[PDB]
Paper text:
Masked refinement and 3D classification, focusing on one [name] hexamer, revealed two distinct species, one with a single [name] bound to a MlaD32-183 hexamer, and another with two [name] molecules bound, with final resolutions of 4.35 Å and 4.38 Å, respectively. In the [name](2:6) structure, two [name] molecules are bound on opposite sides of the MlaD32-183 hexamer, with overall 2-fold symmetry. Likewise, [name](2:6) has a Cɑ RMSD of between 0.7 and 0.9 Å in the core fold across all pairwise protomer alignments, except for those positioned directly opposite in the hexamer, which have RMSDs as low as 0.3 Å in the core fold and 0.4 Å for the entire Cɑ trace. Further 2D and 3D classification of the data did not reveal any evidence for particles with additional copies of [name] bound to the MlaD32-183 hexamer, or for any [name](2:6) structures with the two [name] monomers bound in any orientation other than directly opposite each other. We believe our complex structure adopts a more realistic native-like arrangement than that obtained by MacRae et al. who used a multidentate [name] ligand which likely promoted a non-physiological binding arrangement with [name] molecules bound at positions MlaD1 and MlaD3, rather than the MlaD1 and MlaD4 directly opposite orientation we observed. The [name](2:6) structure is also consistent with the observed two-fold symmetry for the MlaFEB components. The interaction interface itself is made up of predominantly electrostatic interactions, with MlaD32-183 forming a largely electronegative surface, composed of residues from β5, β6, β8 and α1 together with the β6-β7 loop, whilst [name] features a positively charged groove that complements the negatively charged β6-β7 loop of [name], composed of residues found within helices α3, α4, α6, the β4-α6 loop and β2-β3 loop. However, binding to [name], between the β6-β7 loop and the main body could pull the GPL binding cavity open allowing GPLs to enter.
The Maintenance of Lipid Asymmetry (Mla) pathway is a multicomponent system found in all gram-negative bacteria that contributes to virulence, vesicle blebbing and preservation of the outer membrane barrier function. The pathway consists of an OM lipoprotein component (MlaA), found as part of a complex with either OmpC or OmpF7,8; a periplasmic GPL chaperone ([name]) which shuttles GPL across the periplasm; and an IM ATP binding cassette (ABC) transporter complex (MlaFEDB). MlaFEDB consists of four proteins: MlaE an ABC permease protein; [name] a membrane anchored MCE (mammalian cell entry) domain containing protein forming a homo-hexameric ring that faces the periplasm; MlaF, an ABC ATPase; and MlaB, a STAS (Sulfate Transporter and Anti-Sigma factor antagonist) domain protein proposed to have a regulatory function. Specifically, we report the structure of [name] [name] in complex with the [name] hexamer, in two different stoichiometries (1:6 and 2:6, respectively), stabilised through the binding of cardiolipin.
Author numbering:
A (entry chain D), E (entry chain A), F (entry chain B): 37 to 152
B (entry chain H): 24 to 208
C (entry chain E), H (entry chain C): 36 to 152
D (entry chain F): 35 to 152
G (entry chain G): 24 to 203
Write the structure that this text describes.
């Protein structure tokens, strides 16, 4: 079961534990590895493992966090964008970090926002 | 001609055009707006599939006269009751999906988006194009929005009413809803 | 008895529709999906379903959709029967064909952040 | 339950979440159980056949069925509604082997959002 | 331990079972006896028991059905009115019947009322 | 430890089971002693207790009833009073009784008054 | 003054009538009911307990002129807010609770009710009458509605604000709220 | 584990925040809460907490907060680190100091009266 590794820096992980499945489209194609804190600016950093069998995705993908069904634990959701004919594109090698990001959502913030 | 993408582009262009100077005209009679709706939208919509999809299984038994009357009533109904959210005209740009060629199958979905800052994020309107089997001239019929459909609901609601009161009952209801009211535009 | 149709249908997003779940037509169960997999050409899922034999006159231009029951149950597929008429569209679903039109699935969190904002 | 019971037929269009064997209660007290559900290989619509205890036997024909949810997470039970009976005028009585008239349908959390401002 | 009996005819009983508590104010004083149909007009009738330690109460009280907490069982709430000086008052002598109604509430009616 | 008790009337217990903790600003001091009924006006009466270390709460304090979480248990919360020179003062001595109170609430009234 | 029910009934009916008859003058100007509110209703209520209850704790430490200005601006705030709340008339009648004598008490609650058939079912307002410990003059201060207070929330919300910014800070805040 | 170092904080209403809970930052846990008590002088609650030995650099302009977990779970202190800025705010959290700012808890039956009435 050959795989490979990638790194991502988020903003607030939310209730996401360690060791949880990744999902492209609606299937499972990996599992998150480890999570730690940067000792230079205090932002979280997360390592992820994906299967090498898929290896032609572009370099301008996004990444986000979702919830399951009302009251279900989380899982990293991914997305695939457009690939230009070999212009500003390439192939995720084996140590190139993703760029864009999107945080999670917490409860009290929405309620406080709805009033006041 | 062939690529529906060009049709979508020209449609968006001509819709954004000329409708812009209606700001003094919108506060007037909102009656001729039906004519502008008829202008570009109608010549690329297929009422036939709409009818043959909403009418349901009650089609192995039907008479031509009532059929044609229902088709005409549905024509005028969809003419009136489509175009009313246009009152939201305040200005927002449009964008299309990345092109991707194929041209081997018949049914094809595309996409579109509208952008307007300072007030809610953008939305995700869609469409559904179909290649005609009589020649190949593509045409649309359906409309989708964030999961909810816009023809499945009519297929699911107007149920036993047809089963009991009769097709003519639906024709009468549509005659009523044809001049049911005028929008607050 | 198990005299089965088997058919293929695509999508673009399939929520939490795990395998071996039942499909229903009007409100009764008439079989279950056979298998689920992925594509190595454009990264999109495909679903293979199977049907009994008694019901065997479904008109072609039907429709298929996804929905959930109750509030905390398990999702399932809902079918919708079409219509018949000459010239325009015919074709009885013969073994080995593919259901054409489809609709996408519903996810939460999106609209709850859309409205009430 | 050796007491004999007479049966009736009903036709819906979307039972939603019924099931074999459930109580059809009137007012709020249980009476009878549902017998069999099946589809009609001719126009594709469901149909049900049910039982009714024989002690209660004077129902006027102008009545109705309905489907209903229980609690908020509980299942479903048929709910009958006995209607009006006018003297002199012809209204008859449900002798065995008839099929009552109108009905309603189930309700699943999907159509509601759809009918919510489109 | 000594008790006595009373009769009440409602309109719609709701999910109320049998042997459920009848409470005044906030304490428990009675338990319900039996439920049956009226083979003359098809309306429910219910027999209730009151512990006889309490006596001097008016004959113009009211009775209603109540839900418990959020997703709990149901019970029978009472309401004690006033008492004029022996002018249309009297005491609930063993074998009388209260004269008011107040049925329960079901879900679909509210939704239909709110969405028309 | 040396405790001392007090008496207070009410209007609706509202599901307040006997033996439950009081709270003053978020912390638990003492429990409630017992509940009973009156044989002269048909109203409930509640006796409670308090630990002796805290012993300077001015008289004109307040009590209230509420529920924690969203559907867990429910308790009663105290509200510390306003100290009064010149006017009424009175440190609460054993065998007295707290004064003005407040009553609980049920959801059905709100649900009914929200949809007209 | 003697039996509080007398004062309640008389003041309530006089206020309702004075509202109803001069209502065309209210339609003439909406910036006018405040003077009538402060003319008839106010002389019957009490002030000191309101500020005394909402303040709390910080009273052993107190400044005379600061307390004076606070008690001042408090009544302007109260009259403005209550007059703004008044604006809900449409037409409805009133009824009082059944009388019940007692006597040997100091704190006594009563009830009222208002009803209008064509529109919405009735509601249930309350009050809190208090017997004075100096001359027996009964008096009210609080108000309650279907299990919600109007002093408890003001005691529970304006918390740390006082603890940090200062009493004069709350005074300036109120003085700002004096205009809305 | 490794040594720690402690701090003090005031509040106004701690809801249901009992003893022993994580003092997470950003999303990772970094220590527990020591002791809660009341002040027998002006009747207000006070809390003493501890922080691990490894992280030894926090600007003072920080804040604490309380929030709920999921929709019906536990309660954990949530820290919020401000920013660093030379010359102006230089107070480094050494030992035996008290964080200035703070917030309150949130209990259901107060919202209903706060609005929607």
């Amino acid at each position: 079961e050959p795989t490979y590794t990638l790194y991502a820096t988020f903003d607030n992980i939310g209730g996401l534990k360690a060791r949880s499945p990744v999902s492209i489209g609606g299937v499972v194609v990996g599992r998150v590895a480890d999570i730690t804190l940067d000792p230079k600016t205090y932002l979280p950093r997360v390592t992820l493992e994906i299967e090498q069998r898929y290896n032609h995705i572009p370099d301008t993908s996004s990444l986000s966090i979702r919830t399951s069904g009302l009251l279900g634990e989380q899982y990293l959701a991914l997305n695939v964008g457009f690939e230009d004919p070999e212009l500003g594109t390439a192939i995720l090698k084996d140590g190139d970090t993703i760029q864009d990001t999107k945080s999670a959502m917490v409860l009290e913030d929405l309620i406080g926002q709805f009033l006041y | 001609q062939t690529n529906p993408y060009k049709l979508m582009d020209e449609a968006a262009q001509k819709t954004f055009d000329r409708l812009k100077n209606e700001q003094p005209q919108i506060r007037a009679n909102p009656d001729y707006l039906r004519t502008i709706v008829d202008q570009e939208l109608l010549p690329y919509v297929q009422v036939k599939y709409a009818g043959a999809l909403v009418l349901g299984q009650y089609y192995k038994s039907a008479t031509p006269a009532q059929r044609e009357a229902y088709f005409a009533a549905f024509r005028e109904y969809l003419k009136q009751a489509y175009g009313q959210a246009l009152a939201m005209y305040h200005g927002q740009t449009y964008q299309i999906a990345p092109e991707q060629p194929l041209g081997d199958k018949t049914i094809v979905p595309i996409r579109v988006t509208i952008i307007d800052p300072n007030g809610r994020p953008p939305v995700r309107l869609d469409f559904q194009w179909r290649k005609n089997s009589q020649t190949g001239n593509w045409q649309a019929y359906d409309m989708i929005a964030e999961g909810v459909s816009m023809i499945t609901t009519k297929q699911n609601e107007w149920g036993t009413l047809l089963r009991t009161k009769g097709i003519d009952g639906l024709t009468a209801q549509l005659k009523s809803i044809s001049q049911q009211k005028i929008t607050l535009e």
